[PDB]
Write a protein that binds this DNA or RNA. Structure first.
Lengths: 136, 191, 152
RNA sequence: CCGGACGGUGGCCAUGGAAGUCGGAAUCCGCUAAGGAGUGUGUAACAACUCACCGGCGGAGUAACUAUGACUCUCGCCUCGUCAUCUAAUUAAGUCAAGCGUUCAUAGCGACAUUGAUUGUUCACCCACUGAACUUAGUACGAGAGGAACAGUUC
């Protein structure tokens, strides 16, 4: 979360600790995203920081265009897999872990998002809304 | 070095009688009446004549004697407040946000209610003390006026209001918003 | 710009930015208060403001009817509807410019009024006119932002 | 508490401009009760304040370039090395006050003197995060540059 995130976010189950790799779901040239940090996460001895739906992470691209590899950039988690629970009572989950590469302000690097996108992320990051097909 | 006696005069004027037992002062005049307790001090009051009353300290140090003038003054301002009375004026001060000031009442209350102070989302209230009345001066812009018989209650009621409008987290020399005391005087005019 | 769709063109307009051109055409984005955003106060002031009774104003060709309503302090009321409805007539009556055929509204209040159609009928220059009304309002920073600097 | 604080003249040289008030000495005169060739505040530069002082109150030489050294002559510690490469990432109290602080000793300082990788690693060095976000508000202040909070809301 943080910059450019207009909205607050209700807690959702943390799915992705540091080291996790999600699918890159944009058209940027990136094939996956390797999580090295979660923004706005706190501190407890021994705890991995771990992201969830609509969290902004800091990632590198393990697989993808060489102009994207070997460096750290912001991304946003768009699909989960660890099931979480909404305030309408529902426990839900996607089939994959996936997020999209983005700028500190929260602008997509790419122009499409392939696959669905959870609403809690859509609601959080307007330029993600824009590029989303099926939401939730 | 201990001064064998030092004394002071408290002059008494035509409309008032002041009566003292133990060290309890009752001053009564045209404007009503005021009483104050001087037990915490150790001075000796003595009447010379309906228009004169002395106060004296025997064998006192610096600090004791220092307290003797301040007894004179304290009882003076009781006497003047019961004749001329006291009136403090304050004015609102703001660069952008017009400070709106009312008088509300919850349960026999009387409070001075300050809205909008610097845009401030909170509604400020200062209770009106007893013995003190409040007029928003006609003919003058953003002037509040506190009056009554007791300088101490008027003065403090005033300072309660000014202090309820201190600014936080701003350069207080650029952000001069406030309600400041602007004139200290009397209720009866000519004097 | 190049031709666009109806929905699309409107959406881009409201952003205040156009990508190909890469210009932020409008300095600040337009937003409307949620009503969650507004300040929460107990409103009355002196217990409520003034109130008007039923009013009627009849020209002899048009008739206006008004239902008794109440106004409170520190509030804002919108008036909507089509022209020729007597939206203008109503405001005038409250201004005291017009006398009601029936009903009365004699308030103690001091009123400032701005007319709908503005045609000049004042001799004098623009600065002189505004200074007579009030100087000091001209000093405020708010007025610099909205009037003075934009138009010049 | 308050009134008065004056003429030679804006002394003289240094003077870019120094008219009392950065500076070099020199301290006179008239005035009248008393008013310094001038205590501090000085616009560049007078003013305009003020105050004193009257008063009211083993080692070296060598260069048609620096360096090196073909030539002549003589008896892996430092290290976490540097470049790459693999990583998002890689040991894989205080006093004195001369001074600064452009004007000013003490705002801020003060000489002299004196009372998650990598590693066993601690450490160290990076990579990230974050009390924060949201409106309050791109607001108040500011020529702009920029930039608040108290209230309310969610974590």
């Amino acid at each position: 979360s943080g910059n450019g995130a207009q909205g607050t976010k209700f807690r959702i189950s943390l799915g992705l600790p540091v080291g996790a790799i999600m699918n890159c779901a944009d058209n940027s040239g990136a094939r996956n995203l390797y999580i090295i940090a979660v923004k706005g996460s706190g501190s407890r001895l021994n705890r991995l920081p771990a992201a969830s739906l609509g969290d902004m992470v800091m990632a590198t691209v393990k697989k993808g265009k060489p102009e994207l590899r070997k460096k750290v950039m912001p991304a946003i988690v768009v699909r989960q897999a660890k099931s979480w629970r909404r305030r309408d009572g529902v426990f839900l989950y996607f089939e994959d872990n996936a997020g999209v590469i983005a700028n500190p302000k929260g602008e997509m690097k790419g122009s499409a998002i392939t696959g669905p996108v959870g609403k809690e992320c859509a609601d959080l990051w307007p330029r993600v809304a824009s590029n989303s097909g099926v939401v939730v | 070095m201990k001064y064998i006696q030092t004394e002071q005069q408290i002059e008494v004027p035509e409309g008032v009688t002041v009566s003292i037992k133990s060290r309890i002062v009752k001053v009564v005049g045209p404007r009503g009446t005021l009483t104050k307790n001087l037990k915490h001090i150790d001075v000796t009051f003595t009447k010379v004549n309906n228009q004169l009353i002395k106060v004296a300290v025997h064998n006192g140090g610096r600090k004791h004697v220092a307290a003797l003038r301040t007894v004179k003054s304290l009882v003076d301002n009781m006497i003047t407040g019961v004749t001329k009375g006291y009136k403090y004026k304050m004015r609102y001060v703001y660069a952008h946000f017009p400070i709106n000031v009312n008088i509300v009442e919850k349960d026999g209350a009387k409070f001075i209610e300050v809205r909008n102070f610097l845009g401030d989302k909170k509604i400020r209230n200062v209770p009106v003390r007893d013995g003190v009345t409040i007029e928003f001066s006609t003919n003058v812009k953003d002037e509040i006026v506190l009056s009554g018989n007791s300088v101490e209650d008027v003065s403090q009621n005033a300072a309660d209001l000014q202090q309820i409008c201190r600014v936080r987290n701003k350069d207080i020399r650029k952000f001069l918003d406030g309600i400041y005391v602007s004139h200290k005087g009397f209720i009866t005019e000519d004097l | 710009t190049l031709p666009a769709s109806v929905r699309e063109g409107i959406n881009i307009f409201l952003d205040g930015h156009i990508p190909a051109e890469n210009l932020r055409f409008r300095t600040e984005a337009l937003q409307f208060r949620i009503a969650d955003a507004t300040e929460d106060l107990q409103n009355d002031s002196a217990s409520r403001a003034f109130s008007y009774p039923s009013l009627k104003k009849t020209q002899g060709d048009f008739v206006l009817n008004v239902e008794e309503g109440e106004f409170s302090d520190s509030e804002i009321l919108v008036m909507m509807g089509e022209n020729g409805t007597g939206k203008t007539t109503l405001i005038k009556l409250l201004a005291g410019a017009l006398k009601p055929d029936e009903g009365q509204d004699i308030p103690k209040l001091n009123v400032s009024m701005k007319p709908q159609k503005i045609a000049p009928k004042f001799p004098g220059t623009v600065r002189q006119l505004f200074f007579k009304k009030i100087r000091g309002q001209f000093l405020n920073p708010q007025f610099q932002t909205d009037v003075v600097k934009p138009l010049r």
